[PDB]
Amino acid sequence: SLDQCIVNACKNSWDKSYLAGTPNKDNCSGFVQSVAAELGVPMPRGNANAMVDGLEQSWTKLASGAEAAQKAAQGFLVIAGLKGRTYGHVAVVISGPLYRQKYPMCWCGSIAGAVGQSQGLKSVGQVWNRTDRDRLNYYVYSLASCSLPRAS
């Protein structure tokens, strides 16, 4: 794919509650935490702003959304993130055609409701406001999370 393991982790994480009592579909940071936990990727703790701060300090940053999609297609966990004045947002980037040839497809939950939610059917350029989508950071983990295709 080779992002099938990541897509699977997204699907599995959608109905989980990383923070007890708070469905991940209603909590962007919790959703990403559950995905990372399933994949065995260490993550900074906390809300979206805190996670972005941690990723900024420790993870390789990609140059573009196009590169983000390519890395996800190679089996890497790639997080799109941007800090907010009051609330930030984070999302998992997956492989797929770029929206407006620029913005990669994603999975994310959000307390905002539908506008901040994507089950792989929206891009980061639809979830984030127009004044934010060109300001996103894309962080990739140092090792691929996905495995070889099935042997048989």
Short mmCIF file of C-alpha atoms in Angstrom, two decimals:
data_model
loop_
_atom_site.label_atom_id
_atom_site.label_comp_id
_atom_site.label_asym_id
_atom_site.label_seq_id
_atom_site.Cartn_x
_atom_site.Cartn_y
_atom_site.Cartn_z
CA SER A 1 0.00 0.00 0.00
CA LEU A 2 2.00 0.54 2.07
CA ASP A 3 -0.02 2.61 4.54
CA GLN A 4 -2.61 -0.06 5.26
CA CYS A 5 -1.42 -0.54 8.87
CA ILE A 6 -1.85 3.19 9.42
CA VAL A 7 -5.31 3.25 7.87
CA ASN A 8 -6.22 0.24 10.03
CA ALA A 9 -4.97 2.03 13.15
CA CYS A 10 -7.05 5.09 12.20
CA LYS A 11 -10.19 2.99 11.76
CA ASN A 12 -9.58 1.16 15.03
CA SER A 13 -8.88 4.39 16.90
CA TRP A 14 -11.99 6.21 15.69
CA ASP A 15 -14.31 4.63 18.29
CA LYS A 16 -11.78 4.39 21.13
CA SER A 17 -11.46 6.91 23.96
CA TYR A 18 -7.81 7.67 24.67
CA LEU A 19 -8.96 9.85 27.56
CA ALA A 20 -11.58 7.89 29.45
CA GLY A 21 -15.08 9.12 28.65
CA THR A 22 -14.01 11.20 25.65
CA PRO A 23 -14.54 9.54 22.27
CA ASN A 24 -11.54 10.07 19.98
CA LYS A 25 -13.88 11.26 17.23
CA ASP A 26 -14.43 14.27 19.52
CA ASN A 27 -10.78 14.77 20.52
CA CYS A 28 -8.10 15.36 17.89
CA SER A 29 -5.16 14.71 20.21
CA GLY A 30 -6.70 11.58 21.70
CA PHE A 31 -7.32 10.18 18.22
CA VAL A 32 -3.67 10.68 17.23
CA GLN A 33 -2.48 9.23 20.54
CA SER A 34 -4.52 6.06 19.98
CA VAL A 35 -3.20 5.66 16.46
CA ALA A 36 0.38 6.05 17.61
CA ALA A 37 -0.20 3.64 20.50
CA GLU A 38 -1.52 0.96 18.15
CA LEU A 39 1.50 1.44 15.87
CA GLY A 40 3.99 1.45 18.75
CA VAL A 41 5.20 4.99 18.05
CA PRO A 42 6.22 7.05 21.12
CA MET A 43 4.35 10.37 21.31
CA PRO A 44 4.57 13.51 23.40
CA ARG A 45 1.68 13.64 25.90
CA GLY A 46 -1.06 16.24 26.02
CA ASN A 47 -3.41 18.26 23.89
CA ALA A 48 -2.87 19.29 20.27
CA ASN A 49 -0.66 22.28 21.12
CA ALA A 50 1.46 20.15 23.42
CA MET A 51 1.81 17.41 20.86
CA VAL A 52 2.86 19.88 18.19
CA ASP A 53 5.41 21.34 20.60
CA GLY A 54 6.85 17.89 21.26
CA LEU A 55 6.95 16.84 17.62
CA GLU A 56 8.56 20.16 16.72
CA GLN A 57 11.32 19.41 19.19
CA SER A 58 11.92 15.73 18.23
CA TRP A 59 10.61 14.70 14.78
CA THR A 60 11.83 15.31 11.27
CA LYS A 61 9.75 17.96 9.50
CA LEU A 62 8.71 17.46 5.88
CA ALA A 63 8.81 20.19 3.25
CA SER A 64 5.29 19.89 1.88
CA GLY A 65 1.95 18.10 1.97
CA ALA A 66 3.02 16.22 -1.15
CA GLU A 67 6.03 14.85 0.72
CA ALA A 68 3.76 13.98 3.65
CA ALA A 69 1.53 11.87 1.41
CA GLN A 70 4.58 10.18 -0.14
CA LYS A 71 6.04 9.26 3.26
CA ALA A 72 2.70 7.88 4.41
CA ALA A 73 2.64 5.81 1.19
CA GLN A 74 6.00 4.37 2.26
CA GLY A 75 4.56 3.18 5.57
CA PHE A 76 5.52 6.05 7.87
CA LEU A 77 3.34 7.71 10.49
CA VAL A 78 3.02 11.35 9.44
CA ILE A 79 1.24 13.91 11.63
CA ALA A 80 -0.10 17.22 10.34
CA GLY A 81 -0.29 19.82 13.09
CA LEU A 82 -0.68 23.49 13.90
CA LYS A 83 -0.84 25.28 17.25
CA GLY A 84 -3.77 27.53 18.08
CA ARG A 85 -4.23 30.58 20.26
CA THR A 86 -6.64 28.55 22.40
CA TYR A 87 -6.78 25.15 20.66
CA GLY A 88 -4.52 23.47 18.12
CA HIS A 89 -5.34 20.58 15.81
CA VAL A 90 -3.53 17.40 14.75
CA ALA A 91 -4.31 14.80 12.09
CA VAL A 92 -2.87 11.62 10.62
CA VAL A 93 -1.81 11.96 6.98
CA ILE A 94 -2.57 9.02 4.68
CA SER A 95 -1.74 8.24 1.06
CA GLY A 96 -4.09 9.42 -1.67
CA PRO A 97 -4.56 12.10 -4.34
CA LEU A 98 -3.74 15.63 -3.15
CA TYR A 99 -6.65 18.04 -2.81
CA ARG A 100 -6.04 20.97 -5.18
CA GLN A 101 -2.73 19.24 -5.98
CA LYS A 102 -1.45 20.44 -2.61
CA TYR A 103 -3.18 19.06 0.50
CA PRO A 104 -2.92 15.41 1.58
CA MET A 105 -5.79 13.19 2.76
CA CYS A 106 -6.15 12.66 6.48
CA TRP A 107 -7.88 11.12 9.46
CA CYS A 108 -8.73 13.25 12.47
CA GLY A 109 -11.22 13.71 15.26
CA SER A 110 -12.38 17.04 16.69
CA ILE A 111 -14.42 18.49 19.53
CA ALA A 112 -15.62 21.02 16.90
CA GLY A 113 -17.70 18.28 15.31
CA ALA A 114 -18.01 17.45 11.63
CA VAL A 115 -15.95 20.40 10.36
CA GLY A 116 -12.88 19.02 12.13
CA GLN A 117 -13.55 15.33 11.53
CA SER A 118 -12.21 13.19 8.70
CA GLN A 119 -12.48 9.45 8.27
CA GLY A 120 -10.02 9.46 5.39
CA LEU A 121 -12.52 11.26 3.14
CA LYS A 122 -11.24 14.82 3.55
CA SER A 123 -7.87 16.49 3.10
CA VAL A 124 -6.05 18.72 5.55
CA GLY A 125 -6.97 21.57 3.20
CA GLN A 126 -10.65 21.04 3.93
CA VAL A 127 -10.39 20.38 7.66
CA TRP A 128 -8.21 23.38 8.38
CA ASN A 129 -9.38 26.92 7.70
CA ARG A 130 -8.04 28.58 4.52
CA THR A 131 -5.94 30.88 6.71
CA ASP A 132 -4.31 27.82 8.32
CA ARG A 133 -3.95 25.13 5.66
CA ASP A 134 -0.78 26.61 4.13
CA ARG A 135 0.76 27.02 7.59
CA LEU A 136 0.63 23.37 8.62
CA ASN A 137 3.59 21.40 9.89
CA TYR A 138 4.15 17.81 8.75
CA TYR A 139 6.14 15.55 11.07
CA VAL A 140 7.34 12.05 10.22
CA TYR A 141 8.56 9.33 12.57
CA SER A 142 12.11 8.01 12.16
CA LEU A 143 11.12 4.41 11.33
CA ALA A 144 8.35 3.01 9.18
CA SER A 145 5.41 1.60 11.14
CA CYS A 146 3.97 -0.59 8.42
CA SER A 147 5.33 -4.03 7.51
CA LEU A 148 6.09 -6.06 4.44
CA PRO A 149 3.09 -7.15 2.36
CA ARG A 150 1.69 -10.58 3.27
CA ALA A 151 3.98 -13.41 2.13
CA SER A 152 1.01 -15.54 1.15
#
